[PDB]
Enzyme design. Structure first.
Site, PDB file in Angstrom:
ATOM      1  CB  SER A 151      -0.993  -0.012   1.155  1.00 43.72           C
ATOM      2  OG  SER A 151      -2.113   0.775   0.747  1.00 43.72           O
ATOM      3  CG  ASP A 332      -6.115  -2.827  -4.417  1.00 47.24           C
ATOM      4  OD1 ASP A 332      -7.085  -2.438  -3.737  1.00 47.24           O
ATOM      5  OD2 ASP A 332      -4.977  -2.331  -4.287  1.00 47.24           O
ATOM      6  CG  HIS A 388      -5.011  -2.861  -0.726  1.00 50.37           C
ATOM      7  ND1 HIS A 388      -4.498  -2.002  -1.668  1.00 50.37           N
ATOM      8  CD2 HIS A 388      -4.631  -2.361   0.481  1.00 50.37           C
ATOM      9  CE1 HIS A 388      -3.769  -1.078  -1.074  1.00 50.37           C
ATOM     10  NE2 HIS A 388      -3.870  -1.243   0.234  1.00 50.37           N
TER      11      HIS A 388
HETATM   12  C1  LIG Z   1      -2.572   1.756   1.709  1.00 55.42           C
HETATM   13  O1  LIG Z   1      -1.495   2.566   2.299  1.00 55.42           O
HETATM   14  C2  LIG Z   1      -3.180   1.059   2.937  1.00 55.42           C
HETATM   15  N1  LIG Z   1      -2.631   1.117   4.144  1.00 55.42           N
HETATM   16  O2  LIG Z   1      -3.492   0.368   4.953  1.00 55.42           O
HETATM   17  C3  LIG Z   1      -4.517  -0.079   4.156  1.00 55.42           C
HETATM   18  C4  LIG Z   1      -5.556  -0.901   4.615  1.00 55.42           C
HETATM   19  C5  LIG Z   1      -6.590  -1.267   3.741  1.00 55.42           C
HETATM   20  C6  LIG Z   1      -7.634  -2.098   4.169  1.00 55.42           C
HETATM   21  C7  LIG Z   1      -7.616  -2.585   5.488  1.00 55.42           C
HETATM   22  C8  LIG Z   1      -6.563  -2.248   6.356  1.00 55.42           C
HETATM   23  C9  LIG Z   1      -5.524  -1.414   5.922  1.00 55.42           C
HETATM   24  N2  LIG Z   1      -4.291   0.337   2.926  1.00 55.42           N
HETATM   25  C10 LIG Z   1      -3.574   2.696   0.991  1.00 55.42           C
HETATM   26  C11 LIG Z   1      -2.915   3.434  -0.200  1.00 55.42           C
HETATM   27  C12 LIG Z   1      -3.971   4.199  -0.988  1.00 55.42           C
HETATM   28  N3  LIG Z   1      -4.077   3.650   1.998  1.00 55.42           N
HETATM   29  C13 LIG Z   1      -5.396   3.674   2.259  1.00 55.42           C
HETATM   30  O3  LIG Z   1      -6.220   3.032   1.599  1.00 55.42           O
HETATM   31  C14 LIG Z   1      -5.849   4.684   3.342  1.00 55.42           C
HETATM   32  C15 LIG Z   1      -6.207   3.959   4.645  1.00 55.42           C
HETATM   33  C16 LIG Z   1      -6.533   4.984   5.745  1.00 55.42           C
HETATM   34  C17 LIG Z   1      -5.255   5.479   6.438  1.00 55.42           C
HETATM   35  C18 LIG Z   1      -7.532   4.436   6.783  1.00 55.42           C
HETATM   36  N4  LIG Z   1      -7.041   5.404   2.863  1.00 55.42           N
HETATM   37  C19 LIG Z   1      -6.976   6.372   1.944  1.00 55.42           C
HETATM   38  O4  LIG Z   1      -5.905   6.728   1.443  1.00 55.42           O
HETATM   39  N5  LIG Z   1      -8.118   6.972   1.533  1.00 55.42           N
HETATM   40  C20 LIG Z   1      -8.051   8.051   0.486  1.00 55.42           C
HETATM   41  C21 LIG Z   1      -9.376   8.226  -0.284  1.00 55.42           C
HETATM   42  O5  LIG Z   1     -10.465   8.393   0.671  1.00 55.42           O
HETATM   43  C22 LIG Z   1     -10.664   7.142   1.411  1.00 55.42           C
HETATM   44  C23 LIG Z   1      -9.424   6.579   2.145  1.00 55.42           C
END
Ligand SMILES: *[C@](O)(c1noc(-c2ccccc2)n1)[C@H](CC)NC(=O)[C@H](CC(C)C)NC(=O)N1CCOCC1
Ligand SMILES: *[C@](O)(c1noc(-c2ccccc2)n1)[C@H](CC)NC(=O)[C@H](CC(C)C)NC(=O)N1CCOCC1
Ligand SMILES: *[C@@H]1O[C@H](CO)[C@@H](O)[C@H](O)[C@H]1NC(C)=O
Ligand SMILES: *[C@@H]1O[C@H](CO)[C@@H](O)[C@H](O)[C@H]1NC(C)=O
Ligand SMILES: *[C@@H]1O[C@H](CO)[C@@H](O)[C@H](O)[C@H]1NC(C)=O
Ligand SMILES: *[C@@H]1O[C@H](CO)[C@@H](O)[C@H](O)[C@H]1NC(C)=O
Lengths: 412, 412
Positions: A151, A332, A388
């Site tokens: 991620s 994903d 993902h």
């Molecule tokens: C990736 O860095 C990531 N890190 O943890 C997760 C994760 C996904 C599902 C379940 C548990 C952990 N994914 C991604 C890269 C885009 N980051 C994320 O998806 C963010 C997670 C946040 C910190 C809760 N979310 C976001 O970047 N967004 C941006 C768009 O609006 C919605 C969430």
């Protein structure tokens, strides 16, 4: 030889004791930062098995997601009480260092509780913590080292790798990034295509996008100033991420129906790690606040600095000393496979190989597990039908890929 | 009131006897053709429940695939011996007529065993068999009639519907086609896109396709004469259909590893229906050859006549008397969802509605089951995460869609 005060003696929820040693405590990051680690030694020959760092992303999410739900030696069950041995654990063949990072994530903290941070400070703090790991586990300094994550770790890992490569005391051999954020631009452009061609946008919206966002053969879905364009992309973002589709796995339900990443349910891991006896066994100071999978505030205050890892990977490739892998579950939508394939192709490396399927043996027989696009010192792979969290969705395929990577074998 | 010599008394493999009556025998088609039917009356109020014809495609494949493996009242188990009640059977709310068609398919035959046929003869023979059904089941002549099918039945159903609509004795109300072949041109063009954007083709091949097959904003992957183009499309066809990917469901294993449709295993249904006591219970003449799911020879000799159902659906729509549904599992590659969505959009009908998700209640809660694109008298729907055989892959979602269609309710 080891911080034996960190050794995990008897982990709650496990019906059988592990054959491998495991440790849980703190590595010193920069300033007053203390990063909670959980190190699980190899199930086979840990003395000569590689050391593999794992970082989850966010920014602000816990690498103990990787342990307990993706590829750790045991996985938390829906009761949030039981752990069960994972037959596809990455620690079958590696000493795996799961690091909660940056400060404030999970059990990680700092003495001043100031958790606003940025890509460069995060890389430098991770670097100092890895230095500390090897001061604490000096018998591991000569083992081949791989840096891996998922991620946003698409940014964490390459920036960290550039630092590590300047330290001749670390035997860096490779890095692997799963569904990584490598290029905001390639991510965003590829995502709009992905959405239309997976049947999430219809003709009217696509044609609107084509008109306002694109000029002849090229679309700009990333930094377009055009007016209807911004409007349409807002609709794409709504459909993809705010309408009840699981952005992490298009074909999976949205948990909860149409610290709580969207469509996801972290209750099992959360209930497990907030058990007071679990925290004792993991040597967590009692005064620390509750465990959350992702720290809302870390993410809120994070200053993101890099828009692309192009220059980091070109540096890592120039040495010709490291094998690199970018792997994406292809259903994903948070970091879709196509943006990372474009990204790898655009590094324009030598020894390009024709794109091929790669196989895994299921019983069922050989199956195509995905596609591999290979260059000198770098491969892009898809994992067919994974979201993902590739090792949760396709654990055998993930393990098979991981083993071929550590052994620098062909992926096919 | 019914052919009681056709009544199925005690079906082998069923642990409980059905609450509904069911029949198995022959309907007269054209010339010397005898088409094997299996009619399963509605589990609720068959006297006032719709009559729904089901046709599988091929050409040359058996509609008893639909019964025993997709949406019949019971489904054959992997032992090829046990049938188990299906809680999502289409006969919960309909009298479902599964018809093995054309002659030579499954238990269907003709007195001269001449099975070379074509779209027009097939439609006319199906029409005469439906006339026979209503002579045999005269108490069903006033029930609302829907014509449904799958795959090549995308051609069978609309051609049949045009005939039926000219017969005022049949109370035709609607037609539904699942993953239907509607337009070879839209199928083939959409398929090449689908393949690239699902990560099956890389940049090199895509760029080759773009160069030789496309001119500015338009691609021709259907009847292009261009030389490298034909070459590249041969490679696409190889990747998609001849390389170990399951063309019917990209994310499913290829049965057998990397009469036997590719990547599919028809052994359960085959072992069941070739049981000599099963054939007795289904009133099959003992002299008939063995049951195969798809008749190789029917398919070999078939002369396909229509390249598009555009004019058939425009005729069916002009009356404004019928509700039409085209539904596609969106991970199918044999008749991909996008070609059928393009097809429906291109009928250019009135009362266009904005594209929306449609929901199904799982327990888990409401989930997006797919997307719906609606016009006056016609809707296109995706089924999210289903392959070619939508009711096998997503039985609840398939049942929910089917019920909304029969009841002419909104799909959402
Ligand atoms: C990736 O860095 C990531 N890190 O943890 C997760 C994760 C996904 C599902 C379940 C548990 C952990 N994914 C991604 C890269 C885009 N980051 C994320 O998806 C963010 C997670 C946040 C910190 C809760 N979310 C976001 O970047 N967004 C941006 C768009 O609006 C919605 C969430
Ligand atoms: C559709 O008519 C169909 N009818 O039966 C099936 C079926 C699929 C899986 C399992 C059981 C039945 N599908 C499609 C429409 C394209 N027809 C088929 O897929 C043909 C099935 C044959 C008759 C066995 N196959 C083909 O059309 N091809 C063409 C390309 O080369 C490979 C097979
Ligand atoms: C979340 O997970 C927990 C533990 O697995 C489960 O008991 C709960 O029902 C789940 N779902 C929701 C919607 O909270
Ligand atoms: C990142 O953090 C460091 C440490 O606080 C700080 O000195 C630096 O200025 C930050 N960089 C940016 C661009 O904010
Ligand atoms: C096909 O299906 C039968 C019945 O379900 C099963 O026993 C057999 O192993 C299957 N697979 C193959 C590859 O034949
Ligand atoms: C289709 O079949 C009918 C019946 O055999 C035949 O008379 C007719 O000519 C066929 N049509 C074509 C175009 O071959």
């Amino acid at each position: 030889r080891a911080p034996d005060q960190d050794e995990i003696q008897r982990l709650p929820g496990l019906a059988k004791q592990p054959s491998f040693r495991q440790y849980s405590g703190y590595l010193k990051g920069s300033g007053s930062k203390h990063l909670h680690y959980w190190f699980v030694e190899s199930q086979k020959d840990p003395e000569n098995s590689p050391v593999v760092l794992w970082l989850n992303g966010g920014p602000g999410c816990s690498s103990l997601d990787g342990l307990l739900t993706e590829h750790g030696p045991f996985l938390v069950q829906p009761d949030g009480v039981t752990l069960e041995y994972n037959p596809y654990s990455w620690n079958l063949i590696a000493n795996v260092l799961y690091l909660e990072s940056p400060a404030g994530v999970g059990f990680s903290y700092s003495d001043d509780k100031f958790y606003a941070t940025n890509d460069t400070e995060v890389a430098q703090s991770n670097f100092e913590a890895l230095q500390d790991f090897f001061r604490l586990f000096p018998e591991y300094k000569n083992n081949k080292l791989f840096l891996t994550g998922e991620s946003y770790a698409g940014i964490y890992i390459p920036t960290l790798a550039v630092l590590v490569m300047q330290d001749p005391s670390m035997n860096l051999q490779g890095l692997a990034v799963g569904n990584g954020l490598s290029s905001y631009e390639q991510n965003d452009n590829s995502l709009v295509y992905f959405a239309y061609y997976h049947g999430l946008l219809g003709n009217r919206l696509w044609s609107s996008l084509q008109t306002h966002c694109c000029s002849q053969n090229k679309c700009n879905f990333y930094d377009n100033k055009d007016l209807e364009c911004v409007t349409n992309l807002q609709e794409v973002a709504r459909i993809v991420g705010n309408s009840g589709l699981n952005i992490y796995n298009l074909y999976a339900p949205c948990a909860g129906g149409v610290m709580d990443p969207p469509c996801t349910n972290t209750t099992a891991a959360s209930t497990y790690l907030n058990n007071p006896y679990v925290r004792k066994a993991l040597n967590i100071p009692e005064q620390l606040p509750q465990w959350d999978m992702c720290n809302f505030l870390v993410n809120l205050q994070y200053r993101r600095l890099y828009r692309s890892m192009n220059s980091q990977y070109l540096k890592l490739l120039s040495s010709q000393k490291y094998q690199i892998l970018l792997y994406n579950g292809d259903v994903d939508m948070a970091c879709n496979f196509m943006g990372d394939e474009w990204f790898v192709d655009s590094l324009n490396q030598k020894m390009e190989v024709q794109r091929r399927p790669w196989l895994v043996k299921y019983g069922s027989g050989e199956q195509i597990a995905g596609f591999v696009k290979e260059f000198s010192h770098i491969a892009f792979l898809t994992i067919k039908g994974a979201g993902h969290m590739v090792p949760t969705d396709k654990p055998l395929a993930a393990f098979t890929m991981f083993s071929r990577f550590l052994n620098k074998q062909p992926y096919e």
